Amino acid sequence: PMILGYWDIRGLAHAIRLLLEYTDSSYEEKKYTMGDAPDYDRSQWLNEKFKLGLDFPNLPYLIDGAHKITQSNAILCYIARKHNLCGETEEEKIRVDILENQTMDNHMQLGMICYNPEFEKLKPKYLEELPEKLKLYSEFLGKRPWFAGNKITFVDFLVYDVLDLHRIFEPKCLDAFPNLKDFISRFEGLEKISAYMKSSRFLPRPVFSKMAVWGNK
Amino acid sequence: PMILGYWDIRGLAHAIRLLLEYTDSSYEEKKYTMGDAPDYDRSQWLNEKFKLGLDFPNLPYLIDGAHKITQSNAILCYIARKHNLCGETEEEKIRVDILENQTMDNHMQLGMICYNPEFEKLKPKYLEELPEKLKLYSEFLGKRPWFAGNKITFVDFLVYDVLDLHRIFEPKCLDAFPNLKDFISRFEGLEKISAYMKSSRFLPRPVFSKMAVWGNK
Ligand SMILES: CCCCCCCC[C@@H]([C@@H](CCCCCCCC(=O)O)SC[C@H](NC(=O)CC[C@H](N)C(=O)O)C(=O)NCC(=O)O)[N+](=O)[O-]
Ligand SMILES: CCCCCCCC[C@@H]([C@@H](CCCCCCCC(=O)O)SC[C@H](NC(=O)CC[C@H](N)C(=O)O)C(=O)NCC(=O)O)[N+](=O)[O-]
C-alpha cells in the first residue's frame, strides 16, 4: 500500500485522493491534524517532517515503496504514469502540461484571497474576474469529453477540483458554462469516482487549513 | 523559428532562454515593455493578449508552428521533449517532476517577498530560512553531476535559475554548499551556455518586473 500523507483537510490532496480511487490504487492515508487558533499547532507534522526520508519534506507526500514523492503535481504525475493517464499524442501532452500548471495558478489565486485577512475586501474583485477565468476553461474544453482530448488524463482531476472549489465559493459561477457543468456531471458519474463520493473516505471539506479566513471549516 | 514572448526582464523566461540556447533551437524573441510607475502600462501586451490564439493567454508564451504554449513549465517540457531532456528512468522522471514544482515554489517565495511593500521587514526572516532551503538542494544533488542523475535535464536550467537568483540576492549563501557552487560552474561551463552569456542576447537583469520592490532594475 502507498501512503498518502496530508492534513485532515481537502486542500491539495483532493485530486490525488480521487486519482488513487479511480486507478483502484491500494493506499493508506496518514492524516495530520492542525491545532486551533491562535497557535495553529503543526507539531504533529513538524515532529515527523524530517524523519520520513523525503528529499524536500512537504504535505502532501506519497510513499510508494522505495519512491518518496513530494509536490502534489509530482505525486499526480507518478500515479498517472503507472496507469497511462498522461496523454499519448504531443498535442495531448501539451494540453496536460498547460493545464497542470494553469490549475495550480487558479488554485493559488483562490487560496491567496482566502488566506488574506482582508478576504471581504478582495472577494468582490476576485468575483469580477472569475467569469473570465472560467470562460477560458469552457473554451479550451469545447466539445471534448475530457480536457486533453477523448481520453481521461490526471488533469481532468485537477480541473474538476478547481471547478468544484469555485462552485463551493460562488454556486452560480458555472451556470453560464454548460459544458463545464456537463464535465462535472460526467466526472462525478465515473463508477469509481461515484463510489468514493458515497463512501466514508470522502473528504470534500474543509477546503483549506484552519489558518484560512474562508474554507477553514 | 519559434517565438518566445515575454517582458523585457529576466523573470520566468530565464530558463526557457537558456534551454533554447543549449538545444540550439532556432528562435526569435518578442519582448513587451512595461511602463514605469505609477500606472505600469501593460498595453503593449494587453492589446495583443487575445489576438495570438493562445488558449490561456499569459507571459511567457512559445509559438512553435501550430503549437502555441503558455505556462513556463509547459514551455520547458515542450522543448525538453524535442531534445530528450525529460529523464528516461522512472527514478529520473520522479526527480524531474519534484524539481519542476519545487523550483517553482522557491521562485514564488522569493517573488512574494520582493513584490511586497514591506520587503525590508520580510527580508531578514527569508534570509534565516534560506540556508535550510539551499541545504535540501545540496543534499538532493549529492555527488551527482546533474539534478536528475548523470544526464542533464531541463530541471537543471530551473535549479540553476533558482540558485543564481539567491546568489544575486545574498551572494554568500552558496559558500556553505560546495557542490551547489560546482553545479553552477559546470552548468555555466557548457559550451552553448557559456557562449550565450558572453553574447548580447543575454538578459540576466532586471530579475523581476517594474512593480517589484527588489529586482525591478
Ligand atoms: C496562502 C498561500 C497561498 C495560497 C495557497 C493555496 C493552497 C493552500 C494549500 C496549502 C497551505 C499553504 C499555507 C500557506 C501559509 C498560510 C498562512 C499565511 O497566511 O501566511 S496545504 C499544503 C502545504 N504545502 C504546500 O504549500 C506545498 C505546495 C506544493 N507546491 C504542492 O503543490 O505540493 C503544507 O501544509 N505544507 C507543510 C510543510 O511545509 O511542512 N491548502 O490546500 O491548504
Ligand atoms: C504577487 C506575488 C509575486 C509574483 C510571483 C513571482 C514571480 C513573478 C513573475 C511574473 C510577474 C507577475 C508579478 C505579479 C505581481 C502583482 C503585484 C500586485 O498587483 O500586487 S511573470 C509575468 C506574468 N506571468 C505570469 O504570472 C505567468 C505565471 C505562470 N504560472 C507561468 O509560470 O507561466 C504576467 O504578467 N503575465 C501576463 C498576464 O498578466 O496575464 N516574474 O518573473 O516577474
Residue numbers in the entry:
A (entry chain B), B (entry chain A): 2 to 218
Provide text from the study.
With two dimers in the asymmetric unit, the refined structure displayed the typical features of hGST M1-1, including a conserved N-terminal thioredoxin-like domain (G-site) with typical βαβαββα topology and a C-terminal all-α domain (H-site). The electron density map suggested a (R,S) configuration for carbon 20 and carbon 31, respectively, in the four chains of the two homodimers. The glutathionyl portion of the adduct was strongly bound to the protein by many interactions, including several H-bonds and salt bridges, engaging residues Y7, W8, L13, W46, K50, N59, L60, Q72, S73, and D106' (from the other monomer, not shown in the figure). The OH group of Y7, a key residue for catalysis, was at H-bonding distance (3.0 Å) from the sulfur of GS-10-NO2-OA. The fatty acid portion comprising the carbon with the bound nitro group (carbon 31) and the methyl terminus sat in close proximity to the hydrophobic H-site containing nonpolar residues M109, M113, and F209. From the opposite side to Y7, another tyrosine (Y116, on the C-terminal tip of α4) established a 3.3 Å H-bond to one of the oxygens of the fatty acid nitro group. A higher mobility was observed for the carboxylate compared to the rest of the structure, as evidenced by a weaker electron density, as well as higher atomic displacement factors (or B factors).
Glutathione transferases (GSTs) constitute a superfamily of enzymes (EC 2.5.1.18) involved in the metabolism of endogenous and exogenous molecules, widely distributed in nature. Cytosolic GSTs are dimeric enzymes that bear a GSH-binding site (a conserved site known as the G-site) and a binding site for an often-hydrophobic cosubstrate (H-site), in each monomer. Our work shows for the first time that at least two cytosolic hGSTs from different classes, hGST M1-1 and hGST A4-4, catalyze the reaction between NO2-OA and GSH.
